[PDB]
Structure formats: structure tokens, C-alpha cells
Amino acid sequence: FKPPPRPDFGTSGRTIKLQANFFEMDIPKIDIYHYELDIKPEKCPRRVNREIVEHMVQHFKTQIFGDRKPVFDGRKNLYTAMPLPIGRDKVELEVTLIFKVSIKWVSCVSLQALHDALSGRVPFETIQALDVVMRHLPSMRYTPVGRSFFTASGREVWFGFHQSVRPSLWKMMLNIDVSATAFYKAQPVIEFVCEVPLTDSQRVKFTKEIKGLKVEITRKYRVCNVTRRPASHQTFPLQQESGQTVECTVAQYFKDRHKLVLRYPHLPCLQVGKHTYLPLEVCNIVAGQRCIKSTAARATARSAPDRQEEISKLMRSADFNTDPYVREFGIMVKDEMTDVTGRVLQPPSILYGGRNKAIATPVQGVWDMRNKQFHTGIEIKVWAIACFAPQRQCTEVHLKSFTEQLRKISRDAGMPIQGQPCFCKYAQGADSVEPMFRHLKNTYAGLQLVVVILPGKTPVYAEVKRVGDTVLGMATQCVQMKNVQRTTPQTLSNLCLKINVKLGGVNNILLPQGRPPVFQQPVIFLGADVTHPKPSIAAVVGSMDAHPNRYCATVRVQQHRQEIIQDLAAMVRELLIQFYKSTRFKPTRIIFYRDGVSEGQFQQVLHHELLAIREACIKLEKDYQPGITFIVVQKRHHTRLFCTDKNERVGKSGNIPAGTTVDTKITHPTEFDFYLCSHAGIQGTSRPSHYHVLWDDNRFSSDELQILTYQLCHTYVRCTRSVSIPAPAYYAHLVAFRARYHLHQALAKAVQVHQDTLRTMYFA
RNA sequence: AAAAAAA
Known part of the structure; x- marks a missing residue:
């Protein structure tokens, strides 16, 4: 039901001085007075009601308002500094040349409750009121888009910014960030x-x-x-x-x-x-x-010190401390960014394979396949290449050399490609793929992969995937014609990473010697995400190894624009059933990683999804009562972290190093959450992933879960890097996105996958 | 659709 209190702040990793675009707010201890506003007709949008209030505040200066200047929600809420004679009702007012306005007093908003909620004793209405004060005047000047603001200097990019009032430990803060968006x-x-x-x-x-x-x-x-x-x-x-x-x-x-x-x-x-x-x-x-949905990429992005300058430039431009409505309430927003001292965790060593094994130690979130090979290589005895670009624009000599180099690297990669392509074809037309695709598996028993080659944008990839994994059960790997004429020792190396695990192999496992105590018992890791377009597609992936490396995916369809997962009880059970079949064990702990859930849905998602994950466990056995760890991950927030010392910036991005964790200062005061930059920033400003833990029976410490989250991001099997989110929550994104290319029993039948493909990771 | 990162 309710989230757990923060266990601790932990002491792991080396400390680093950072800055965040969280700006402290000196909040007064006075009371705020809220007034409901029913205006007829109620059909008017957000902007017009703000003009109506803007007009009547000047019109009735002698009657009701006087010295006060009121902030307006935009719909039906109006807060003021000190009370009005309106208190106890009622005034009915016309706006001249037609709108009848009613100002009704509601209740007093006590600010000390916030000053107390950040030190024991989280009133949403109070934070709801503080945002309206800061939001009001920029809503007059700029065109509001959700929380962000924009101004006008067949799409077109508008440069604006984001603003939101967020609570933190002991004090209140203002989050500001530069934002750009495509506009028609x-x-x-x-x-x-x-x-x-x-x-x-x-x-x-x-x-x-x-x-x-x-x-x-x-x-x-x-x-x-x-x-x-x-x-x-x-x-x-x-x-x-x-x-x-x-x-x-x-x-x-x-x-x-x-x-x-x-x-x-x-x-x-x-x-x-x-x-x-x-x-x-x-x-x-x-x-x-x-806008609902190259030149947009150049206007976006910039170095992390570059973005840090724009936010401060913008903080100078707004000058919130001289905002007439912020003056009225007495709020003061510091002109300086908040100093936060993060922690950089050690990346877990990674055991590779072959007789030469090896231990990859990630530096700045990167390692390499160099002098290493796969933990469980899959020697392919036979496969079938099927290029879909003509020999008028391709040639056998490409594929004679493309396979020549590809065979050479897989020899080094640990999954030795010892056989040779049973056949090597040229085929065109998305329709003729299926008749060919049928004939290839019958000609060769023990057949494994089909390397289909796809030139540019084409819907054949939809059918090659739709017929590939859902029906016959053969493995499938695609590659553009752009990458068959040009073969660098890494474009083909990232391919062997994907192919090996898609054939049931293990590319790498975390160093089992250095692993948190949660692996002392059998534990399963889950990731869930919903991708919206008619039907929203939900996917839940579960751990299958104890390494953990191999996963299995379950994906369903549900209501349009629905964020909750009703079939979570069915999917988690089916997922956890496959855990016993593969591991021979029952997982003592479920570590659930949920993606795409905003705090406005925390009470809605946690209530149902935790009950569904408990319904899944109880249908197996009457007394199967393991511990659930409900972790909501967030990448679409607006928190930014920059390096205080130039000697800690990494790369041309100037971003923070990988493993940067923040428990203090800018996190939720009472509950348990943290920001974690599991990856290293290649481009633009890194957005550190935020993890809010809604339920935890496993009695986790802050350290052990932060290290566990960091270690799971290394287990990605499609690159020699750490990634944004842990692999379960990442794999869930692929699966729900892979189901989209599978085009009302038929929809669930189309999203359903074949039995032999369901055995391992068809999605990676 | 080699991959990560970036909106």
C-alpha cells in the first residue's frame, strides 16, 4: 500500500562534487488562501480563463482585490497571499464584452506543514499551490506545454524551458531545465x-x-x-x-x-x-x-557544461526573486545551483569465456571484446544467408568477403562459425519472403540462424520478424546493405554479441566472486514497460539464469493508453513458472523493475501491480510467499548533474562518470529513492536514471540496491557497455517494441511467440 | 535493421 521509509544513505564508492538544476526556495511560514473559480461557460481552454482572471483582477481592484495580486491555476483555482473579503461566499461577476465568474473561499493552506513535512510528521495541495505561484507569470508570457514553457523564437523547433516545484530533504527546491520541442x-x-x-x-x-x-x-x-x-x-x-x-x-x-x-x-x-x-x-x-510525433539533432544536445551554462543563463533571465507574484508570497529562489556530493560505484568485473576466460574491467562504462571470447559460445554448424538487395547493387564478392570476415571474427569471438552458409541467395519482395522462409528449415535439420540482409527503409523487416519468431521458430538476424559493403571489426563484433545469445549462448557474466548477498539465495529479476501508439503493448521479462544473463519475455496487449498491466498476474506467473523449469529452484525474491510510471500513477500502479505479482505467486503454491521489490525506474525526468571540477568531466560531453549515485539533497525526503547514472555520456547532457522503490520486503540497504542496479546495467548483451536502465527493464522495452512490428483474439495471437523462440531471447 | 548514447 504505502512506500517504505528510507533505510539509510549508505557509504559505497568514491565521492564527487556535483551540481544540480535544483534551486533552493526560501519558503515563508505564512498561510495561503485558496479560492474555487467556476466560470461560465466552463468550455474555455487553459489560456482564456487566465485572461478572464487577468481582466477581472484589474476591473474589480476597488471592489474585492485591492493591494493583493492573485496567482491563477488556469482552471478553477486562485491562491492569494492574505485573505479576501470574498471569504464565506459569494460574488458573481461579469467580464463585459459575457462570462459569469464565481469566487468561493475554500480552505487555508498552511506552509509550515511543508516546513514540517520535510523534517518528520507530504501535503500535495501545498506543493500544488507553490507550483501555481511560480507557474503563473511565465504562463502569461510564454505558451505553456505541460510543465515546460516555450516561445516562438512541416515542423519547426521552438526553444523554451521546463519548470517544476519539487520537494526534497529539509527544504523545497525549484527544478529548471532548457527544453526544445518540434512544433507545427x-x-x-x-x-x-x-x-x-x-x-x-x-x-x-x-x-x-x-x-x-x-x-x-x-x-x-x-x-x-x-x-x-x-x-x-x-x-x-x-x-x-x-x-x-x-x-x-x-x-x-x-x-x-x-x-x-x-x-x-x-x-x-x-x-x-x-x-x-x-x-x-x-x-x-x-x-x-x-508536434504529435538531423537538423533537429544539431539544435538539441550540447556539452554538459554547455547546458549548465544555459540553465544559469535562464535563471538570470527569469530572475524569480524579482517576480511580482513570487514577491507577493515571499518565496526566494537562489540564483545558484545546488551543490550535491555524489558517489561513483565500482563496476563489477565481467567474466568472459573460452579457455583464456578473461576479466573485463569497465572504465567509463566501456570495455571491449579484445583478446576475449564468449562465456558460452554457440558454434553454428549451418545457417542460411538471404540478401534482399539485388546483385545489380550487391555481389557475391561482398558476401564472399562479408562472411570471410564474419567467420574470422566469430572464430575470435568464441562462437566459432565453423560451418559455411548452406546456400546464399538473392530474393526480393516482402511477400516472397514467407514462401522462401518456409522452405529453408525443412532442407536442413539442426538449422539455426538466417542472416537476412535488408536495404534501407522497408516493411519486410516487419514480416521477416512477424514470420520469424511467432510462427516457424527459426532465429533471425537482420543487417542493412550499408553494412555488407562496409565491415569494420566492430560492426560485425556487435553482431556476434546479439547472435550468440539469440542462439541460447552466454556472452558474459558478472564476476560471481564480487556479487551482492542477494545472490546467496535464488532470486528472479523482472522488467516491465508499456509502449503506446490502437492497443498499448505491455511486456514483462524475467531472469532465467543465476548469473544473471539469459532472460525470457512475455508480452501482452491491453487497453489503449492504459499504463496498468492487468495480465501481470498471468505474465509474472508464467515467467516465474519458466524459472523453475530452467533453474530447478523457486525464486526466494522477486526484484521488479517497472518503467514508465509517473508519481501521479504510483498509488495506482503499485496498488494493482503488486497485488498482481502477489496473485501470480499464490496461484503456484498456497504458501509460496517470496519477497517483492517494486522499483519504478525513470529516465524521462528533468534532474541534471554536472561536474564541479573540470578534472572529473568525462569526454567531449563533459558529463558525469558512470555509476554516479545521489541519495542526499535532491531526493525524496522521507521515502527511498536515488538517482543513478549507470552509463557514460557519449552525446549531449546525460540524464541520470532515477529509481523510486515503492515496495521492498527483502529489507534492502541503500548501498546493496544501488550496486545491484549498477551491476545489472552491465549485463546488457548487445554492447560492451553499461546502459541507461537495468537489463530487465531494458529488455522489456525491446519486447514491447518488438511486438509492435508483429502488426480480437488474433492480435494476442499475433503478439504470442513460438515455443522454441520463447526458450531464449529472440528480442535481443 | 551492429550498438550505445542524445529529444
Whole structure:
């Protein structure tokens, strides 16, 4: 039900001086007064209600407000510094040239409760109020997008920033970060049509780009569909002065009431609202809407000291300590970043294979395959290469050499490719793949892999994967034609990493000598993530080794945009059933890693998902009562950590080193959480993964779980690196994403995977 | 779809 109290802060790893974009807030101890605001009509969006309050605050200065300046939620909440005569109800107010406004007093918001909640005794309404104060004035000036703000200097990038009030130990802080987002450019639709008579293929793409967007007339209409018929032919039921309803072409209607004759009658019409039709000549896309979905990569990113400068530049630009509404309440936001002292954990040694074994020691989150080979190499006796690019643009000599080098490296990689390709084909057409794909497994018993080669963007990868893992059960490895003409000793080396484990092999295992005490008993590791598009796809992956290296995946479909997992009881049980079949043991502890859950869903996710993970254990045996560790991981937060000393920055990114852990200062005051940069930053500013532990029966310490989380990120089997999140939560992302390429019993039947592929990691 | 990182 409720999260556990933080056990400790731990003492592991070397200390490092850092900075965070958390800015301390000097909060007064006065009370805040909340007022509900019911305005008619209630249909108006966020921005208009803020203008209504903005107009009535000046209008009724003598009547009700006076010296005070009120902050506005944007909907139905209004906080003030000191009380108003409005208290006890009631005032009904008009806004002149139509809105009737009602200001009703609610309750007093005591700020000391926060000053007390950070030192014993977490009132959401108080933190809800402090954000409204800081959010209010930037909402006036800039265009708000969720929590972030943006301004205006066929997509277009708008540079803005993010703002949020977050609680921390002993005090309150303000989180600010530079943010950029793609926005649909304020274009006339005719140029929006131009930038993306129309053919059915020419037309159907435009409908995908503009559906659900808002346009104006040369009113506010949200587009629903793009007509098949042009303006000169599309009709609508027009009534006449007589009363009878004749059919009228949309081109001729503008020719009568609006005196406008269309220049582009051959183009279709934007359907707005039903029964309304608008041609493309008179429509401009509404400015200020976030885009739903190379040049965008150059504007984004920058060194970590570069981003650290922009946040401080922006902190100078806003100057929150001189914000008239922040002045009214007395809040003071420090102009300096918060100094935090993190800890860099030791990376676990990694045992490789072959008779020469070896011990890879990761430095800056990287090691190499050099003078090493696989812990459990899989010698491939036979396989079938199937290139899908023509010998007009490819040649046997490529594949004669591509396999020549590939065989040479797998010889060094520990999975010796001793056989030779049973056949080597050229085949084109996504449809003819399946008939060929059927004929290859029958010709060769003990067959393993099929190296299909795919040139550029193509939906054949969807069918090669759909027919590959769900039906017949053969292994499948894809590679672009761009990588068969050019073979560097690493492009092929990362391939042998994926292929070996996809054939049941073990590329590497953590040093068992140096391992936390949670491995003294049998323990299973789970990862879950939901990817939304109609149906949301949920995947749950479970540990199968005690190393732990090999995993197994279960993926289901569920309600559109649903973040909870109802089939968690079914999937965890099925996952944990496969654990006994492979390990011969029952896992004493379940370590659940959950991804994609915001704190607004913590009480909703933990309640159901922990009960489902307990329903899974109880269906096995009446007394199978292991310990559940519920860990929500977060990568889409906004916390940033920068190095105080230039002698600790790593690479051109200037980012923090791998294994940087933070328990103090900027974490949740009472509960148990921490930020952990398991990886090293190659590009831009690193975003350290945050782990909030909602349930823990296993009685973990802060150290042991932080080291366990760090060690699991090394166990990724697709690169010689540490990664963003632990491998279970990472593998869950692949599986739910792999099910997307599998295109209502048939959907679950399409997402269901074959038995022989379910044996190991088809997804890696 | 060699891979990680970056929105």
C-alpha cells in the first residue's frame, strides 16, 4: 500500500562534487488562501480563463482585490497571499464584452506543514499551490506545454524551458531545465500541403499529417478528416430560403456567400468539426501546438557544461526573486545551483569465456571484446544467408568477403562459425519472403540462424520478424546493405554479441566472486514497460539464469493508453513458472523493475501491480510467499548533474562518470529513492536514471540496491557497455517494441511467440 | 535493421 521509509544513505564508492538544476526556495511560514473559480461557460481552454482572471483582477481592484495580486491555476483555482473579503461566499461577476465568474473561499493552506513535512510528521495541495505561484507569470508570457514553457523564437523547433516545484530533504527546491520541442509551423495549409489532383497515395499521407490539428480561416477548427473529393465536387446539405435541403458543392458555396472563387479547386477539402467542409486555400494551421510525433539533432544536445551554462543563463533571465507574484508570497529562489556530493560505484568485473576466460574491467562504462571470447559460445554448424538487395547493387564478392570476415571474427569471438552458409541467395519482395522462409528449415535439420540482409527503409523487416519468431521458430538476424559493403571489426563484433545469445549462448557474466548477498539465495529479476501508439503493448521479462544473463519475455496487449498491466498476474506467473523449469529452484525474491510510471500513477500502479505479482505467486503454491521489490525506474525526468571540477568531466560531453549515485539533497525526503547514472555520456547532457522503490520486503540497504542496479546495467548483451536502465527493464522495452512490428483474439495471437523462440531471447 | 548514447 504505502512506500517504505528510507533505510539509510549508505557509504559505497568514491565521492564527487556535483551540481544540480535544483534551486533552493526560501519558503515563508505564512498561510495561503485558496479560492474555487467556476466560470461560465466552463468550455474555455487553459489560456482564456487566465485572461478572464487577468481582466477581472484589474476591473474589480476597488471592489474585492485591492493591494493583493492573485496567482491563477488556469482552471478553477486562485491562491492569494492574505485573505479576501470574498471569504464565506459569494460574488458573481461579469467580464463585459459575457462570462459569469464565481469566487468561493475554500480552505487555508498552511506552509509550515511543508516546513514540517520535510523534517518528520507530504501535503500535495501545498506543493500544488507553490507550483501555481511560480507557474503563473511565465504562463502569461510564454505558451505553456505541460510543465515546460516555450516561445516562438512541416515542423519547426521552438526553444523554451521546463519548470517544476519539487520537494526534497529539509527544504523545497525549484527544478529548471532548457527544453526544445518540434512544433507545427504557422503555415497556410496550401503551403503545408506543399511542404509534405492528388493521387490516393499523394492524399493519404497528408491526412496523417494534419488530422487532429487546428486551422484558421482567411475561427478555431480542429481537423477530423481530409475529403476524397475536391472542392468542385464535394457536396454538403445546404438549406434554402424555401426550406428544402439541396446539395451544394463546397466550391460553389464560397462562390455565393463569400464572393470567393477558388484557384485550386482540384485539391481536396479539410473537414472540420460532421458536416462542415473547408477548402485548403483559406486555411492556416493554428500556431502554438506541440508536434504529435538531423537538423533537429544539431539544435538539441550540447556539452554538459554547455547546458549548465544555459540553465544559469535562464535563471538570470527569469530572475524569480524579482517576480511580482513570487514577491507577493515571499518565496526566494537562489540564483545558484545546488551543490550535491555524489558517489561513483565500482563496476563489477565481467567474466568472459573460452579457455583464456578473461576479466573485463569497465572504465567509463566501456570495455571491449579484445583478446576475449564468449562465456558460452554457440558454434553454428549451418545457417542460411538471404540478401534482399539485388546483385545489380550487391555481389557475391561482398558476401564472399562479408562472411570471410564474419567467420574470422566469430572464430575470435568464441562462437566459432565453423560451418559455411548452406546456400546464399538473392530474393526480393516482402511477400516472397514467407514462401522462401518456409522452405529453408525443412532442407536442413539442426538449422539455426538466417542472416537476412535488408536495404534501407522497408516493411519486410516487419514480416521477416512477424514470420520469424511467432510462427516457424527459426532465429533471425537482420543487417542493412550499408553494412555488407562496409565491415569494420566492430560492426560485425556487435553482431556476434546479439547472435550468440539469440542462439541460447552466454556472452558474459558478472564476476560471481564480487556479487551482492542477494545472490546467496535464488532470486528472479523482472522488467516491465508499456509502449503506446490502437492497443498499448505491455511486456514483462524475467531472469532465467543465476548469473544473471539469459532472460525470457512475455508480452501482452491491453487497453489503449492504459499504463496498468492487468495480465501481470498471468505474465509474472508464467515467467516465474519458466524459472523453475530452467533453474530447478523457486525464486526466494522477486526484484521488479517497472518503467514508465509517473508519481501521479504510483498509488495506482503499485496498488494493482503488486497485488498482481502477489496473485501470480499464490496461484503456484498456497504458501509460496517470496519477497517483492517494486522499483519504478525513470529516465524521462528533468534532474541534471554536472561536474564541479573540470578534472572529473568525462569526454567531449563533459558529463558525469558512470555509476554516479545521489541519495542526499535532491531526493525524496522521507521515502527511498536515488538517482543513478549507470552509463557514460557519449552525446549531449546525460540524464541520470532515477529509481523510486515503492515496495521492498527483502529489507534492502541503500548501498546493496544501488550496486545491484549498477551491476545489472552491465549485463546488457548487445554492447560492451553499461546502459541507461537495468537489463530487465531494458529488455522489456525491446519486447514491447518488438511486438509492435508483429502488426480480437488474433492480435494476442499475433503478439504470442513460438515455443522454441520463447526458450531464449529472440528480442535481443 | 551492429550498438550505445542524445529529444
